[PDB]
Paper text:
A 60-kDa FAD-dependent oxidoreductase, AIF allosterically switches between two distinct redox states. NADH binding by the oxidized AIF monomer reduces its FAD cofactor at a centralized active site, allosterically disrupting hydrogen bond networks to release a 50-residue surface loop (C-loop) and stimulate dimerization at the AIF surface. Oxidized NAD+ and reduced FADH– form a long-lived charge-transfer complex (CTC), which stabilizes and maintains the reduced dimeric state of AIF. NADH-activated AIF dimers support import of OXPHOS subunits by CHCHD4 and are critical for mitochondrial function.
To understand how SAXS CX1 and CX2 chemotypes engage AIF and enable dimerization, we crystallized select fragment hits with the W196A dimer-permissive mutant and wild-type AIF. Crystal structures of the W196A mutant bound to CX1 fragments and the underlying 4-aminoquinoline (4AQ) scaffold revealed that these scaffolds localize to the NADH active site, mirroring the native NADH ligand, as do CX1 and CX2 scaffolds bound to the wild-type protein. In all four W196A structures, the CX1 quinoline core aromatically pairs with the AIF FAD cofactor, positioning the primary amine to hydrogen bond with the E314 side-chain carboxylate and the W483 backbone carbonyl. To accommodate this amine interaction, the aromatic side chain of F482 must rotate out of the binding site. Halogen substitutions at positions 7 and 8 (fragments C12, D1 and D3) optimally accelerate dimerization. In addition to hydrogen bonding between the primary amine and AIF active site, the structure of top-ranked fragment C12 additionally reveals a unique halogen-π contact, which places electronegative fluorine compactly against the F482 and H454 aromatic rings, reinforcing their pairing. Although fluorine attraction reverses and rotates the aminoquinoline scaffold, the primary amine still hydrogen bonds with the active site. The dimer-permissive W196A mutant also allosterically releases H454 into the active site, absent NADH ligand binding. This points to H454 release as a preconfiguring event that allows CX1 fragments to engage the AIF active site and stabilize the dimer. When the AIF(W196A) mutant is co-incubated with CX1 fragments, the oxidized mutant fully dimerizes and remains dimeric throughout the time series, similar to the wild-type AIF–NADH–DMSO control.
Author numbering:
A (entry chain B): 126 to 510, 561 to 611
B (entry chain A): 128 to 509, 561 to 611
C-alpha cells in the first residue's frame, strides 16, 4: 500500500499501545484519520496468548487460526481487530468519516520534529499533525550466544512475535530437548507451555537462570521458591543459580557450559532475558532518553514535545504518585496508549489509573500485580487456603501488590495504592482480598 | 486579584517580565497577571552587585538608577509603573495589558483545576501558567549551626533590600567578609573594595577553591583573577573551608578547617542558589534530582498548560543535554521562549543565552554554553583572550576575557558543532593573534 503524504494522527509502531491509541482517538474524534506504521507484516495483535493460551488450545489448527478461548470461555483472535475494521492507507484521506489504516512492512527510520514529518525505510515521507511513538522494545540476547557461532545463533529463539510462536511450536514437535534461558515471567510461561507439550510427546524441557528461583527479581524468596516447584511439576527441569559461560555445538546438539561445573545438552535454546526499548528515533528527532530506566523520557501526560507522545514499553513517564518509571506490561500498553490518544485529542490527562499485570504459570498458578513490584523492596505477605497477597512497601506505604490466585479484586489493590495510607496492620488490609 | 486570568506568571522577576512582553507581542490583546511575593515591581538584579555600587550619585540607594556602558542612565526596573495596568482593571481594560500583584505569594498549585491559591486565601484560575519562581540563596551549615547573633550579622545578597542593607553596613562597620568565590562573591568584593578604599575599611573574601571562580575558570586564569581582586583592595583567602563561626567580644570569629581564624564585623554568604520548587509538591510536578529545579522538556513545558523558565527551570537542551542555567540573559531568553510557546510557538530552546561578569573596571568576562573548570580547556591570550571548553572533541563552552561585541561569534561556534583542527585559528575570530 502507498502511504499518504499527510495524515492527522500518525502512530509509529503497530502493537498494543498503538492500537489502543487508535481506538481512543477514534472514540473521541469520530471522523479521525489515523495511520499506523508497522515494521511487522501483521496487523496489531496482543502478545500474551503467544506464551499461554495458544499452547493450551484444543484446536489442532491453532498455529494457523491464532484463535483461543478466554477465561470467560469465549473464543477470539490474537488480533485486536479483523482486517475489515481497518481502511487502506491510500484511501484514508478520502473515506467518509475517516478510519484507521495500518501500513505494514514499513519502518519509520527518521523523525523530523520541527517539520512534523517522518521518513520510511523506502524513502516515503509523511507529515503529521500529532504523532505517537509506540515502538515497544527488542528482546535482549546473551553475550555467550553472541560470542557463539552461526549455528548456535540459528538454533536460538528470541520469543516475541507470531513467527516465534510458530517456529518454536514446530520445533517442539521435532526435537527432544529445548532449553529456556531466563527466570522471568516469559521464560516461566514458556516452560509450562513446553512442559505440557513435552508430557504428551515424552520430550525434555529445561529452564535455567541465575536467580535462586523463578521470578527471583519480582517475588519474595519463599514465593519464588514455591513457584519453581510448581514449574518443575509441569514437567520442567529447572536449574536455578545458573550463569551461562559459553554455548557450542557437540555432535549436532547444543552444549551449554555454566559458570559452575554443570553442563547442559539440548537441541534448541529459547532466550527470554529481557527487553531493550526501541529508541533509535530519538537521535534524528532530538528526543531525550532516560539513562536510568531507558526509553523515551516523557512527562505525566506521556508527552515528549508539543505534538509527540510516547506510550507502551518505550515510554519512560512520570508517575505523579509512584515517580518516574518505565513499564513493560500488556495492560500498561493499553492504558498508556488509550491515555495518549485522549491527550492527542486535547484531554491533557496525567497517568493516574494504574495498569495491572498478570501471569499464568499453568492452570493452577495465577498471578496478578499492580504498582512497584520488586523483590528488593520490603514485603509483607499474607496467605491462606493456596492463595495470598504480597504488599510491597516504601515510605511506610503500599506501592505494589501481588495477588496469588486471587482474581477480580485488582480494583481493590488499585485503590489501596492510590489512597497511600500508612496501615497499622496489613492483615486487616488482607481481608479486603478475602484472606482470613 | 481577578478570579480568572488567561496568562498567569508565578514570580515577578526577569523571566516573568520577559514572558509577559513576549506574550503581549504575539497576542496584542493578551491579559497577563504576574504574581510576585516581593513588594517591588519586576527589576534586573545584575546592577545590585555592580553598577549601583560605582554610581557617583549619593542618592543611588533611593533612585536605583545607574549609567550603562553606553552611558545612558536607566532604572533597575524593567518598566515604569505606568507601563502596567492594575489587577482590578486587567479583566476589563480594552486591549488587555500586564498587571503585577505585588506582595502576594502563590502557596498552592492545583494543576487539575488550573488554579492557584495565594497566601491570603485568594484563588485564581488560569488558561496558561508560567512558573518563574527563581531561587533562594543558600546558607552555610556553619552559619546555620551558629547562634542568632551570627545569623543576624550574615547577609544573603539577592534583592534590593540586600543591596540597601549591605550598603548601609559598609558605611558603619570596619570589616566585611565575603564567603564564596563565585561571580557574585567576587563582584561584591570588588564593589566593597572600591567603597572601602575611600573609607579605609577592610574587605575579606574567602572560599575553598584555589582562586576566584575556581569552579568556572581554569586554574591559571582563576589565579590571575584573584590577583586583580586583591588589587581592588580585597584580602583574598583561597583554600579556606569554614569549620565554624561564632561571636567573640562583639566580633565575628570565623574558624577554618586548616586552623586559620578570621576576625570580621559582618559576613556576606554568596555560596550558591536553591531553586524555589516548593510548588512542585502540591502541583505534582517533577523535580530534577541531578540539577534541581522543575524538570521540563526542550520547549520549557512541564504539563499541558504549565511552563517553567529562568533559574528554576531544568530543561532539555537538544544540543547540550539536560541543564539548569542561572544567568540573567537566560531568564530573558527562556522567559521570552516560554511566552512564545504559551501562545502556540512550540519552539525548543535553541538560541543559547550568554552570561557576563565585571570584576572592577579592568576585568570583563563574557561566556556562553557549558563552562566548567572540570572540562578540558584551551586558552589563547594576547590582557585579553578566549577559553574553549571541550567535550566529544567539540567546543561546548567559551569564555571571553576582555573581548566584547563578539558573543554571536562564540554562539555560532557552539552551534556548528565542528571538530576544529586548530583552536588558535578559531581564536582569530575573536581578534586574538
Ligand atoms: C510472548 C509475550 C507474552 C507476554 N505476556 C504478557 C502477559 O501475560 N501479561 C502482561 O502484562 N504482559 C505480557 N507481555 C508484555 C506485553 O505484551 C507488552 O507490554 C506489550 O506488547 C507492549 O506493547 P507496545 O505497543 O508498547 O509494543 P509492541 O507490542 O512490541 O509493539 C511495537 C511494534 O512496533 C514495531 N516497531 C518498532 N520500531 C518501529 C519503527 N521505527 N517503525 C515501525 N514499527 C516499529 C515493533 O516491531 C512492534 O511491531 C508479553 C510479551 C510477549 C512478547
Ligand atoms: C546580585 C545579583 C547579581 C547578578 N549579576 C548577574 C550578572 O552580572 N550576569 C548574569 O548573567 N546574571 C547575573 N545574575 C543572575 C540573574 O539575575 C538571575 O539569573 C535572574 O534574576 C534569574 O531570573 P528569574 O526570573 O529566573 O528569577 P528571579 O529574578 O529570582 O525572580 C523570581 C521572583 O519570583 C518570586 N517568587 C518565588 N516564588 C514565588 C511564589 N511562590 N509566588 C510568588 N512569587 C514568587 C521571587 O521572590 C522573585 O521575586 C545576578 C543575580 C543577583 C542576585
Ligand atoms: N556576574 C554574576 C553575579 C551574580 N550571579 C551570577 C550568576 C550567574 C552568572 F552567569 C553571573 C553572575
Ligand atoms: Cl566554606
Amino acid at each position: 500500500d502507498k502511504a499518504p503524504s499527510h495524515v492527522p494522527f500518525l502512530l509509529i509502531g503497530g502493537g498494543t499501545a498503538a492500537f489502543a491509541a487508535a481506538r481512543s482517538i477514534r472514540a473521541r474524534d469520530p471522523g479521525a484519520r489515523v495511520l499506523i506504521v508497522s515494521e511487522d507484516p501483521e496487523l496489531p495483535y496482543m502478545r500474551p496468548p503467544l506464551s499461554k493460551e495458544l499452547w493450551f488450545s484444543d484446536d489442532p489448527n491453532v498455529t494457523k487460526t491464532l484463535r483461543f478461548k478466554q477465561a470467560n470461555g469465549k473464543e477470539r483472535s490474537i488480533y485486536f481487530q479483523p482486517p475489515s475494521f481497518y481502511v487502506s492507507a491510500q484511501d484514508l484521506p478520502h473515506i467518509e468519516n475517516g478510519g484507521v489504516a495500518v501500513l505494514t512492512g514499513k519502518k519509520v527510520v527518521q523523525l523530523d520534529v520541527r517539520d512534523n514529518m517522518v521518513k520510511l525505510n523506502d524513502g516515503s515521507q509523511i507529515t503529521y499533525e500529532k504523532c505517537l511513538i509506540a515502538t515497544g522494545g527488542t528482546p535482549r540476547s546473551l553475550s555467550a550466544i553472541d560470542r557463539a557461532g552461526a549455528e548456535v545463533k540459528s538454533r536460538t529463539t528470541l520469543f516475541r512475535k507470531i513467527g516465534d510462536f510458530r517456529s518454536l511450536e514446530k520445533i517442539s514437535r521435532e526435537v527432544k530437548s529445548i532449553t529456556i534461558i531466563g527466570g522471568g515471567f516469559l521464560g516461566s510461561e514458556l516452560a509450562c507451555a513446553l512442559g505440557r507439550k513435552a508430557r504428551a510427546l515424552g520430550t525434555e524441557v529445561i529452564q535455567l537462570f541465575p536467580e535462586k528461583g523463578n521470578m527471583g527479581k519480582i517475588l519474595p524468596e519463599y514465593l519464588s521458591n514455591w513457584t519453581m516447584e510448581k514449574v518443575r511439576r509441569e514437567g520442567v527441569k529447572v536449574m536455578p543459580n545458573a550463569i551461562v559461560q559459553s554455548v557450542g555445538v557437540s555432535s549436532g546438539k547444543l552444549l551449554i557450559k555454566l559458570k559452575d561445573g554443570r553442563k547442559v545438552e539440548t537441541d534448541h535454546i529459547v532466550a527470554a532475558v529481557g527487553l531493550e526499548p526501541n529508541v533509535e528515533l530519538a537521535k534524528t528527532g532530538g528526543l531525550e532518553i532516560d539513562s536510568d530506566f531507558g526509553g523515551f523520557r516523557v512527562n505525566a501526560e506521556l508527552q515528549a514535545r508539543s505534538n509527540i507522545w510516547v506510550a507502551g514499553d518505550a515510554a519512560c513517564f512520570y508517575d505523579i504518585k509512584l515517580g518516574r518509571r518505565r513499564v513493560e506490561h500488556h495492560d500498561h500498553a493499553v492504558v498508556s496508549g488509550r491515555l495518549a490518544g485522549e491527550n492527542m485529542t486535547g484531554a491533557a490527562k496525567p497517568y493516574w489509573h494504574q495498569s495491572m499485570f498478570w501471569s499464568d504459570l499453568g492452570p493452577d498458578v495465577g498471578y496478578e500485580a499492580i504498582g512497584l513490584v520488586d523483590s528488593s523492596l520490603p514485603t509483607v505477605g499474607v496467605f491462606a487456603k493456596g492463595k495470598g497477597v504480597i504488599f510491597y512497601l516504601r515510605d511506610k506505604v503500599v506501592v505494589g501488590i501481588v495477588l496469588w490466585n486471587i482474581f477480580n479484586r485488582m480494583p481493590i489493590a488499585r485503590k489501596i495504592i492510590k489512597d497511600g495510607e500508612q496501615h497499622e496492620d496489613l492483615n486487616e488490609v488482607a481481608k479486603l482480598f478475602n484472606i482470613h
